[PDB]
Chains A and B, each alone.
Chain A
Amino acid sequence: DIMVPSFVYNKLPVIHFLQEKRAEQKLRRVLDETYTEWTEELDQAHVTDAITRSLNI
């Protein structure tokens, strides 16, 4: 009725602070590991060159 309640009350602030920091850490990780991926596609010049070769030119 008296002791354990008081010590729980004393614990509350530190735990709240640490959990807030942990959540911030996880969202920070979410944004950190995002990168824009630029894909590379076969240049159409080679396609045009192959078309010319097929024509026997």
Chain B
Amino acid sequence: ISGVSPLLYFPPTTTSTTNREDQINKNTNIAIQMIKR
């Protein structure tokens, strides 16, 4: 890490509003699609 970096690392959290329900819904949809195939 030789060389002064231009920015300090910060968490990539930008999609602040991420309900657990939506994430599990998307996982279910992907799971269903793969199972069907």
- Give the B-binding residues of A (Cβ under 8 A): 42, 44, 46-47, 50-51, 54
Are B34 and A46 within 8 A (Cβ)? yes
Count contacts on B: residues with CB < 8 A to the other chain.
6
Whether the Cβ atoms of B35 and A51 lie closer than 8 Å is no
A46–B37 CA distance with the chains assembled, in angstroms: 13
Give the interface SS of chain A, mostly helix, strand, loop or mixed: helix
Give the distance in Å from the alpha carbon of A33 to the alpha carbon of B26 in the complex.
44
Q: 1/0 per residue B20-36: CB within 8 Å of A? A: 00000011001100110
User: Which 10 A-B pairs rank lowest in CB-CB distance, beginning with the nearest?
Assistant: A47-B31, A51-B27, A51-B30, A47-B34, A50-B30, A42-B35, A50-B34, A54-B30, A42-B34, A47-B30
Known: A47-B27, A51-B31, A54-B26. 13 other contacts (CB 8 A): A42-B34, A42-B35, A44-B31, A46-B34, A47-B30, A47-B31, A47-B34, A50-B30, A50-B34, A51-B26, A51-B27, A51-B30, A54-B30
